[PDB]
Design a protein around this ligand. Structure first.
Ligand code: HEM
Ligand code: HEM
Ligand SMILES: Fc1cccc(C[C@@H]2C[C@H]2NCCc2ccnc(-n3ccnc3)n2)c1
Ligand SMILES: Fc1cccc(C[C@@H]2C[C@H]2NCCc2ccnc(-n3ccnc3)n2)c1
Ligand SMILES: C[C@H](O)[C@H](O)[C@H]1CNc2nc(N)[nH]c(=O)c2N1
Ligand SMILES: C[C@H](O)[C@H](O)[C@H]1CNc2nc(N)[nH]c(=O)c2N1
Ligand SMILES: [Zn+2]
Lengths: 403, 404
């Protein structure tokens, strides 16, 4: 039937009936659960996704059955019948983008879902125009450190025509320069994208925190290279509140977390270039970006600066170092007046969100393994909260790298 | 290419495929519509097919699959179920299935040790006094004065039209939880119910934070009887911190032996309702869950205050700091007292090795990511970065309803 969802800290029980409105399969079956996998392994179709979304939309503005509702359904119906596709009204698009964020099972920032600035960029016809749009998104979202959630939406995909794409996974990323002695200077996650940029004519640096250029691709054209104006890219030097040697490590991170390679699906329409940004949760930088073994991997360095017993695991040097690194990030962002949220405040707001959604929709799709932060899991309330995972539409999806 | 789940390690870039999951006979809670992977609690013909499957597992494991002894044992079991409705396991079959149930347990991070398990056959036990004796023997052997040893004691199987053997307590060692007149709980809140049950059954209760509970043991079709463990059998470790000298003054302690006693051990359709097993602790079980869960001892605020942290703002990471020191204290104290313990780094490293071993041996390993990843320092350990497939294999350990 419907999943009984229990919170083990409070003894409380909800029933998820929102999951019944899932029209898309996930990776699991009764025989085996694949919930920990990061990636996923005619015109009547399109028409029904379209009607469904238009229905959601008119329900959202409390105008179901009305004249504008009926008329909008026929517009969509007439357009698909004749051209095999259709187009969204700006207001529908705004609604759709907001629902997509709201439906995102991995996002711990969804308390904010109704407060999203949506830029319509569907009147874009060149890489160069994409660059102008992207720069404005960055300026707006960054806002001198008082970060604001934004999405910019580029022209949808069209049958038998290449996609608009941003090649970079994030609008802001540090280069990863593969040294021929195996090692990597900079961010190992970005070795491939850095190499692509160089091949398309970028003059490379030799630092650990070199901001990449963007490769933008207008349909069926080679990607073009655009160096972002340094004044648009706000960064925070990292220093520790009590450990005065920490700043000497020469660490920094950018302020704007903007995903640029995910696909946005609304009403059966697909937007292959639709970068979005909010603000960082501190553990994203402090734990994953700086401490992941296959990223900057600074745990041992900091642990030695703290004069810790690296010899054995049981001294918990790793854990001690990690906490200070995360503390340094929160302190540094706070000192620079750049918006940040720690994992405790984050998960506390997420619980409140689960509650809002239970009353609003009868449930909330959430991915436990992603919502629970990378350190201090059970210290946060989400750890103790059962969650149901499923795919609702509108939705953000992964898509292949365009190369 | 391959028609089996693809499994990736994101730290190392390595790919595997799980073919073992194909052997799964029991469905879990998930469907294509929704993932319920994070939920904690999600006929002779029937028996025969389960039994045949197990005897096949057994003969495969001794490499006599297809043999005469194999086909004979099958006929023996089929003929035994024929005249009685049940069958019985040979001793070494019981040992194999006990070890295979542990090896199959998706939630257990200690499975590297699965081959080294002492199996105490107690299928001759006929009273509650006898259960207590066997349990005491288990505690003595498993504890081994601090040099801990994996063990399980198997009591008689469920029998048609006859009451189960049951240990009412969830563990062999558990602290009491006394509900106060002011609504609070003294001791361990996890154990309020079992505590009140012990009292109802005649236990004279203490009033400490760390009172060991008596066992409520139940022989077929009999009321449970109460048994107090002799204190010298129950090894405890006082908790101190290696540098913070005041930590020892908190008066915190924990027992050495983690022994689960309310789980049902299923082998070839046969159900062993009382089959307590024990290993040694992974340090975060004590330091993070037992000592810091809000609904357990909840000492995080206490420790933080002592460390002089700013408990008024989340962004001080005072929870994170205190939690680290509490885990360090758990480790340091067990080490100092020479009681076996494994930290969450060492444990996960060893579990990675287990996965590699099982990949070669069985072509996969069922594993519950939410339960394998530790409750602090998640992405600091390698299993965080390891994708896992979860499914039910048999023989298996299973949750069972509480006897009352
Ligand atoms: C406003 C502050 C926000 C915070 C604090 C936040 C937090 C997070 C975090 C921690 C993750 C996990 C990502 C990872 O660790 O790789 C995530 C993922 C995600 N977020 Fe946000 N988020 C915010 C805003 C937004 C916005 C504005 C959108 C889109 C409109 C969004 C959509 C998503 C999606 C689709 C994912 C999944 C990404 C993936 O599967 O790789 N979030 N969020
Ligand atoms: C040898 C050292 C062992 C270690 C370090 C270990 C570690 C763990 C840990 C950390 C858990 C998670 C439980 C929780 O967080 O509440 C667990 C669960 C489990 N273990 Fe072990 N274990 C060990 C031995 C054993 C043995 C000997 C058996 C059985 C013969 C066993 C069977 C299980 C089962 C069935 C679970 C799942 C419990 C549940 O779902 O409630 N383990 N183990
Ligand atoms: F190679 C890969 C294949 C699949 C997933 C992967 C990691 C996922 C991309 C990361 N998911 C988003 C990470 C991120 C970065 C910056 N900002 C945000 N962000 C912004 C708002 N909400 C999240 N997310 C790598
Ligand atoms: F109220 C509840 C309902 C369902 C599950 C829950 C937590 C699971 C009991 C805990 N799982 C066993 C915990 C445990 C304790 C002591 N030792 C061991 N142990 C020993 C060897 N391997 C594990 N596990 C509470
Ligand atoms: C294998 C595992 O599922 C994978 O590493 C996941 C776990 N949870 C995560 N959670 C967040 N927030 N971000 C991640 O990249 C991941 N990775
Ligand atoms: C809701 C969630 O599934 C629950 O809190 C789980 C998460 N992971 C766990 N992991 C372990 N090892 N032990 C547990 O009791 C739990 N509890
Ligand atoms: Zn699942």
């Amino acid at each position: 039937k419907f999943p009984r969802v229990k919170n083990w800290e409070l003894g409380s029980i909800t029933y998820d009936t929102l999951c019944a409105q899932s029209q898309q399969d996930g990776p699991c079956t009764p025989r085996r659960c694949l919930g920990s996998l990061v990636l996923p392994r005619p015109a009547e179709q399109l028409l029904s996704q379209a009607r469904d979304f238009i229905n959601q939309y008119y329900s959202s503005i409390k105008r179901s059955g009305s004249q504008a509702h009926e008329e909008r359904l026929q517009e969509v119906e007439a357009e698909v019948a004749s051209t095999g596709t259709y187009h969204l009204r700006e207001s529908e698009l705004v609604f759709g983008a907001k629902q997509a964020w709201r439906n995102a099972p991995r996002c711990v920032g969804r308390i904010q879902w109704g407060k999203l600035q949506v830029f319509d960029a569907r009147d874009c016809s060149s890489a160069q125009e994409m660059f102008t749009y992207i720069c404005n998104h960055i300026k707006y979202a960054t806002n001198r450190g008082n970060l604001r959630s934004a999405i910019t939406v580029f022209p949808q995909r069209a049958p038998g025509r290449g996609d608009f794409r941003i090649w970079n996974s994030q609008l802001v990323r540090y280069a990863g320069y593969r040294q021929q002695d195996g090692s990597v200077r900079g961010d190992p996650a970005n070795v491939e994208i850095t190499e692509l940029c160089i091949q398309h004519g970028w003059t490379p640096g030799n630092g650990r925190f070199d901001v990449l250029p963007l490769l933008l691709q207008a349909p069926d054209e080679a990607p073009e290279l655009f160096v972002l104006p340094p004044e648009l890219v706000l960064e925070v030097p990292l220093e520790h509140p009590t450990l005065e040697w920490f700043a000497a490590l020469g660490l920094r991170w950018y302020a704007l977390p903007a995903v640029s390679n995910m696909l946005l699906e609304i009403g059966g329409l697909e937007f292959s270039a639709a970068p979005f940004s909010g603000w960082y949760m501190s553990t994203e930088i402090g734990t994953r970006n700086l401490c992941d073994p296959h990223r900057y991997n600074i745990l041992e360095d900091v642990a030695v600066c703290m004069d810790l017993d690296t010899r054995t695991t049981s001294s918990l040097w790793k854990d001690k170092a990690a906490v200070e690194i995360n503390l340094a990030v929160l302190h540094s962002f706070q000192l620079a007046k750049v918006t940040i949220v720690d994992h405790h405040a984050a998960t506390v707001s997420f619980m409140k969100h689960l509650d809002n959604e239970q009353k609003a929709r009868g449930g909330c799709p959430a991915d436990w393994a992603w919502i629970v932060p990378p350190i201090s899991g059970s210290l946060t309330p989400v750890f103790h909260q059962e969650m149901v995972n499923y795919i609702l539409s509108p939705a953000f999806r992964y898509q292949p790298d365009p190369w």
